[PDB]
Design a binder for this molecule. Structure first.
Ligand SMILES: O=c1[nH]cnc2c(C[N@@H+]3C[C@H](CO)[C@@H](O)C3)c[nH]c12
Ligand SMILES: O=c1[nH]cnc2c(C[N@@H+]3C[C@H](CO)[C@@H](O)C3)c[nH]c12
Ligand SMILES: O=c1[nH]cnc2c(C[N@@H+]3C[C@H](CO)[C@@H](O)C3)c[nH]c12
Lengths: 282, 282, 282
């Protein structure tokens, strides 16, 4: 790990003295969900590039900012553009923000992302709550906590079986009910793979057999660091496509479809998240 | 990644100006298949060591060369001796050649290798066409594309479900028919594991349950980079041994058997590949 | 790998000339099993920190020593405190000792550890003999042998299907019989995951489906290097807890329970190991 405890500290204090805002909830916007930033009131923007110690967003479009503000009553801090392992970032960089949030006083982390559907029940457009995850990179050593543990953040061997707040998932199925929507709110297990290339049919079948419902290339690391911090964690995935699971189909997963689906489900997610805010304690 | 775009460029241009040859098809010879180099006509040899930016073949025998020439009508470039992850090479070195070939004008990549049989149907000597692969190293981060993407080579999120040219596999089952052989031409999924040590019984059973038919320690990376380049990809494995899947057997996988099997299936593979050449478009 | 052959040599010779002891059996004490060091007679202690080239035990408690002596007749060398991948150590450091032992003249390696129970048959307190292992980190590249092979230690492609000495496991089931205990001596497959965080329910289910019986974050690397050396290998796990495999349970794996269980099974393991010593040939 390239960061010493002071680095997280100095980044937090810098932000703390450059904004009057004091967030309680940190929200990480996945692919094609960055719109959530518009609904914040008294919004103060910070380009990642100007924040001390932040991973310099190489070239995904150079768009990477930390937006502070109020979202339906709660003091939020949003990450528009997140860091992925496939871009070359070691996991201690990918999750650097999460530890900064903790030192800012945040106690809740909402993670969202796009993901391919492994469960045949799911359909494009669907929203899947994350009940659990399978951290494939983690089994091999790519775990954000690898390296000496710092007591100031958490214990050496944190547990993950209760990573996704049982309360928030219930208060979420409620919100969806109140919202009264056609499709029911899905719920399942998210499996993380490093990417960046898409899975093959044989790989899709492996992920299904392992019991995964959706597949992505992020989230799990942030969740692990969050939990190690004591943060409350809630998250969901937007099924932007159904992974090819048979050799006959002449269809291929592509970033166009993923962003396209993110486009149509845009406001649908903004509402859900915005309303869900009120359901977060304090 | 230690290579900048110019490095691939300079390596290509160097070769381009040191040989009159202009290959269309690149062939990577797996273990005990290097013989394919004899059948090239107007053969021009280059030791890896003399090619700018090529991974310096540490000590597997110091035998590593790029042979250009004509193989049954087609302008070929062959790699005699390939780089493996288990030798310590990062994947961006292992696959460095593939990107060089692309800049040389190659549009087709033929990959061959030796592999242990997971499918009980298979028998030593058998040849298995690769319909698909399971990239275990890739799930954890060991993907040759990890790092910033270069638009000049391909897209950020390339798809792999159609990696193995459906046309060539058919034109290959044909060639085998024409060849009229005892054993039928096998076809299946290749799973890559890093090695270098051989799998245990419990590991063999895992790989079988995942739906793999053959197991090796290479290929997948080159295939991924090839596809990311737009190259056409065809490949097969020579089942040199049947992996131990029960605790009673007092047999052990060994490099002697693997090379021995490669020895007997020698000319059988040279024919197949040589004839298959004519089946490649242009 | 940061070590050259001379480094292993110089470390061995240093020890060889600083102790009159000449061990035959090397014993690696897992979590809460370090007590085995008390039963050695003519015990000579060496702090890791004073041994040339040894990984400097960062901050797990600064307790890391190599204890030489006699254990029930045999010349032993014990490692009290072992190196884990999750602490940040590359595998060639984690397994550095094993190669040192080989050069000291050791021909047998006994590895012990604590592990969560995946097999429902098992219960806390149980002792599971290791018949086989599933090296998940190894499938992705985290294999201690990665890098150029040194003929002086072993072959390039060592086999692992016969890693756990069939003879010693039998002579062990015997010893347990003689010992006449309530619970029968368990036996099974150990799956290694990198950690340091504990598995989720979805991950537990994956590990069960793969056929694993117990789960830990160590051992496999040392075993692989041992075997590559020609060493005889025997090992077992102390089931310190049953991994959570259903979402209803409001229980969580924790280092307190693990050490607690290690505490009660303390002397039970010391006896077993001590007596087992006589069953090791010479
Ligand atoms: O089919 C899929 N496989 C793996 N990840 C994704 C995702 C998630 N994100 C989306 C994004 C690519 O379009 C990249 O960062 C991965 C959507 N669909 C799939
Ligand atoms: O049983 C097996 N397991 C994993 N790989 C192979 C291979 C393939 N190559 C062959 C070569 C070792 O003999 C090494 O580079 C791996 C043949 N048989 C097996
Ligand atoms: O449930 C489990 N999952 C993974 N490893 C262990 C272990 C083994 N060791 C024990 C130790 C943590 O308490 C750490 O180094 C892992 C015991 N229980 C479990």
């Amino acid at each position: 790990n390239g960061y010493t405890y002071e680095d997280y500290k100095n980044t937090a204090e810098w932000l703390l003295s450059h904004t009057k805002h004091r967030p309680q909830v940190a929200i990480i916007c996945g692919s094609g969900l960055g719109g959530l930033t518009d609904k914040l009131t008294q919004a103060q923007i910070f380009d990642y590039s100007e924040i001390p110690n932040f991973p310099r967003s190489t070239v995904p479009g150079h768009a990477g900012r930390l937006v502070f503000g109020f979202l339906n009553g709660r003091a939020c801090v949003m990450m528009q553009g997140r860091f992925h392992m496939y871009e070359g970032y070691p996991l201690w960089k990918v999750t650097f923000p999460v530890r900064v949030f903790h030192l800012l006083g945040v106690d809740t982390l909402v993670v969202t992302n796009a993901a391919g559907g492994l469960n045949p029940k799911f359909e494009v457009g669907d929203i899947m709550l994350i009940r659990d995850h399978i951290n494939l990179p983690g089994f091999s050593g790519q775990n954000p906590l690898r390296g000496p543990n710092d007591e100031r953040f958490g214990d050496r061997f944190p547990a993950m079986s209760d990573a996704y707040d049982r309360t928030m998932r219930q208060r979420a199925l409620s919100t969806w009910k109140q919202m009264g929507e056609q499709r029911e709110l899905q719920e399942g297990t998210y499996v993380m793979v490093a990417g960046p290339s898409f899975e093959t049919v044989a790989e899709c079948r492996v992920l299904q057999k392992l019991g995964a419902d959706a597949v992505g290339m992020s989230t799990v690391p942030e969740v692990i660091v969050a939990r190690h911090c004591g943060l409350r964690v809630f998250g969901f995935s937007l099924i932007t496509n159904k992974v090819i699971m048979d050799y006959e189909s002449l269809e291929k997963a592509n970033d166009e479809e993923v962003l396209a689906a993110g486009k149509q489900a845009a406001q649908k997610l903004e509402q859900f998240v915005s309303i869900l805010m009120a359901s977060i304690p304090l």
